[PDB]
Amino acid sequence: LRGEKIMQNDRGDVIIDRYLTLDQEFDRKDDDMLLHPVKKIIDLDGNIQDDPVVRGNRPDFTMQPGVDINGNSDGTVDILKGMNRLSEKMIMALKNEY
Amino acid sequence: PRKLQDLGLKPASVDPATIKRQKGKITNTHMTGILKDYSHR
Amino acid sequence: NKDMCPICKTDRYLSPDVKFLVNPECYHRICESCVDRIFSLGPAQCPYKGCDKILRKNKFKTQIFDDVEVEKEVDIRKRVFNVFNKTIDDFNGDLVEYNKYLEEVEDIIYKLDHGIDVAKTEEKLRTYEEL
Amino acid sequence: MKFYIDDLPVLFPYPKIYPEQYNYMCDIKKTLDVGGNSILEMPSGTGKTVSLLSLTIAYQMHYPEHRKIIYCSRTMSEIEKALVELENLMDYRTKELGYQEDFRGLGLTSRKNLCLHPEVSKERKGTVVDEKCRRMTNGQAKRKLEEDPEANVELCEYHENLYNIEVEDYLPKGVFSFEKLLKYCEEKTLCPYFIVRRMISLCNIIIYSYHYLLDPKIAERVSNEVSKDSIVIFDEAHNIDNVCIESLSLDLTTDALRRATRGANALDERISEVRKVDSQKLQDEYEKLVQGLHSADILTDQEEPFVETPVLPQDLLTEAIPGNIRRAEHFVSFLKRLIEYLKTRMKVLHVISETPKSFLQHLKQLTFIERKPLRFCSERLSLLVRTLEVTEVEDFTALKDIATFATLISTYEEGFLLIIEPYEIENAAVPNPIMRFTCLDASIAIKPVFERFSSVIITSGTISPLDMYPRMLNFKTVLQKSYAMTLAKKSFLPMIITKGSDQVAISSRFEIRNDPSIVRNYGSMLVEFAKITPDGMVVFFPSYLYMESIVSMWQTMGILDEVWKHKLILVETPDAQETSLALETYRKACSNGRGAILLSVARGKVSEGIDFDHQYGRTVLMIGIPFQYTESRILKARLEFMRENYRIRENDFLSFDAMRHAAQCLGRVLRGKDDYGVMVLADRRFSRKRSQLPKWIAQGLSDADLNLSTDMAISNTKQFLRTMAQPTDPKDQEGVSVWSYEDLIKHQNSRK
Ligand code: SF4
Ligand SMILES: [Zn+2]
Ligand SMILES: [Zn+2]
DSSP: OOSOOOOSSOOOOHHHHTTHHHHHHHHHHHHHHHOOOOOGGGOHHHHHTSSTTOOOOOOOGGGSOOBOTTSSBOSHHHHHHHHHHHHHHHHHHHSOOO | OHHHHHTTOOOSOOOGGGOOOOOOOOSOOTTTTTOOOOOOO | OOSSOTTTOOOTTTOTTOOEEBOTTTOOOEEHHHHHHHHSSSOEEOSSTTOOOEEOGGGOBOOOSSOHHHHHHHHHHHHHHTTSOOOGGGGTTOHHHHHHHHHHHHHHHHHHHHTSSHHHHHHHHHHHHHO | OEEEOSSOEEEOSSSOBOHHHHHHHHHHHHHHHHOSEEEEEOOTTSOOHHHHHHHHHHHHHHSTTOOOEEEEESSHHHHHHHHHHHHHHHHHHHHHSSSOOSOEEEEOOOGGGTOOOTTTSSOSSHHHHHHHHHHHHSSHHHHHHHHOTTOOOOOOHHHHHHTTSOGGGSSOSEEEOHHHHHHHHHHHTOOHHHHHHTTGGGOSEEEEETHHHHOHHHHHHHHTTSOSSOEEEEETOTTHHHHHHHTTOEEEEHHHHHHHHHHHHHHHHHHHHHHHHOOHHHHHHHHHHHHTOOHHHHSOTTSOOSSOOOSOGGGSOOSOOOSTTSSHHHHHHHHHHHHHHHHHTTOOSSOEEEOHHHHHHHHHHHSOOOHHHHHTHHHHHHHHHHHHTOSOOTTTHHHHHHHHHHHHHTTOOSSEEEEEESOSSSSOSSOOOEEEEEEOOSSTTTHHHHHHOSOEEEEESSOOOSSHHHHHTTOOEEEEEEOOOOOSSOOEEEEEEEEOTTOOBOOOOGGGSSOHHHHHHHHHHHHHHHHHOSSEEEEEESOHHHHHHHHHHHHHHTHHHHHHHHSEEEEOOSSHHHHHHHHHHHHHHHHTTSOEEEEEETTSSGGGTOOOOTTTOSEEEEESOOOOOSSOHHHHHHHHHHHHHTOOOHHHHHHHHHHHHHHHHHGGGOSSTTOOEEEEEEOGGGGGOGGGSOHHHHTTSOGGGSSEEHHHHHHHHHHHHHHTTSOOOHHHHTTTTSBOHHHHHHHHHHHO
């Protein structure tokens, strides 16, 4: 929750870890709580879908999320999304019923 | 392990032979048991 | 039929020096070790279950493409193109005749690959060799 | 206002006008009247789009020729801004001339941006959207429904409702932005995509992206409808070479070929199935192929080829099908053994770079595939798929890649290279071979444009140096110049930071990204600027991987915790929609005074059209020079090609590429002359690139700011922000930076 990369070596606590998978479900429920159509002025999705048949050269590894030797994600994008979600939730909470 | 390594089979062991088993006259002495050795920082 | 000789069951893990070869006659994979012992003395029937087509050790080669069917087509294509071979200039720039000639050659290759009419087609290949 | 050029009356939609805008308009008219191309570089703090539309629209409406206009932007988001400006300009004209003149202006984009079908617009990729729309609009469904009403094939009410009305009555006269276009079409159940595509021949001005002018796949259909005498505007064309190169490039992976064999086998099975029950279709196609017809004469205007033409239309052979691939089974065998050759070429153990000729020669040797049939691969496959009734084409999708590769490598031989690498990612346990077909010359894709159209205007805010674009892209210009903004009081403070407060050098070199001193020095600069920046602060990084690593390092150091107290942290992510949500949040936090900081990539999605003006941008933090990854086979090949052909030194191009992106991000902070912000270039290597910055940015960069420290930059920023918060004296800008009608007339009198 602090936006820190989890270390496998760290023992943690047995009781609280049971809620880790539940949080993975709350984040999904929160991603939809924030998702909504975006104005075309700053819609970055339409720029990549402007020409759906673009086939060029795949970008270098410096222009892609980091991966490990085995090929799976290193996990730094998750904390980037976590802070992104924290800011989005704070701003959305401002526009409450009051 | 050497014989297995000649046939192309990866040997899961090693030859044990490769296991590398790893002043004088002082001035002031009335401070007999006070001076702690802070040699490095 | 994954990485081991179907005859001797010599897996690649225990014999990393294993190397396979194919014979155009039946395109059956076989490791080099079996080739020497079965064919060194002379011609013998293929050591496969259901295959009785004799072959010689001197004919074995290395498979180029990972697909056996394409290997058969390419080798037949090489055999036909060694006989049926012309160019656009051979018909004085007549593209219609050249395209028809190309279609006929493809039909010949298709028939030889799938055995539609082996006897008539094979004779035609032999006949055109004289001309 | 409504002022006059030599004989052209032009109606500006504002009562005031900048001196730069008038000079910009005068130069554009001079280029239009004299004919030819020009490269104009106007600052970002001056209205460029409004000036272009004002003059060009007036030019088309006054002269007898009534030349049309083609407006090319780089992203879809820019088309909206251009259309909004066009609507504002035309509304002013309708109110000053007393009537709405006959005028039509439409934007153009893909189906994904304009699909109103409740079940087809819910897709996450545009290729699927096109497939489903084609299934309901190709005409197969309509013909089957005509013969037998009981058929369950569905249609699109939007597409069908258009047939009732005529093409001239799809939309009312005026300018339609996408926001307005979708609203109008929803109330009448019409397809905006098909309305736009069927009205390009009637538009006075058509606005689309560069991919619809340079990419042969989507360009040929659109290009055939526009006029030949139209005015062509290249807006924000400082990175047009990248678009030109990706149009004739392709990449093949082991997964692609493994998925291609399955499709070829499925295609052979489908042919066998069709052979047994319905064989007249095959003979009918074969008969027309023998005659000499191609896709154009066989396919109806309603249907589209399965494989988009991957080469420029001028390089397609006009002769009949060679005959080898004339029959279905022969073509399938031809296709299968081509795939096998590609697979056996993926087993190399070292990087191999070869010309298309060498690849063709080896192909002709191992197998017996000649060049000419390989050129018809894409054309033939579209016919075979069309005649096979392939209602679901999920299996055959992979074959579009093989066909595209086949038609490219057999067409071009100069300016193209084929790189095969055993490691797409060098940091991998198991090699993953890749095969890249790269375009080295950037002028091959833009050659048709500069010959088809007489007058072309290449304009951008940061297009410098201007000599290199004629060099890189083989075209010549009647005039190329850059304007310097006549700002009464300095409004932007460009600074270069070379070291930290400890005087240790700072750089974004990738090899020292994980350095405790450089990481902490950059983090301290980020925090200190976050303390004095009032509303918004954008930070651009050389690459996404560099940003990911350094941000993670900051988290451990605790630098982020200090930033969180003053501003919200929004980060650019690979997902486009999530980044769009981040932009929405970042703008919201800037407006309500909460303060926000946006971390993005200099060469990413944010930098290619999103503008951070007024409160959305008050400080720009360029963390390092955005260099490419030098150890890239594609870039090294391109650098070698440019050196031998255009005599461009490798270091010169690399610096030019990096600066054109750094300047690109700098210019997205000023909209008018009442806008201000601080531009800091944080890299020791920036200190010698002042002469490489745009003229209007270089003029504002002082000799004392060429190599500053973090503390000295903070002190200057605090003084500058305090100075820009004071009420400006109107007399200081009454007639030197902003012009009324009377001032403009004076400028026309003294000059003459
Ligand atoms: S016709 Fe238009 S609305 Fe209907 S599916 Fe196609 S793109 Fe979507
Ligand atoms: Zn064997
Ligand atoms: Zn056999």
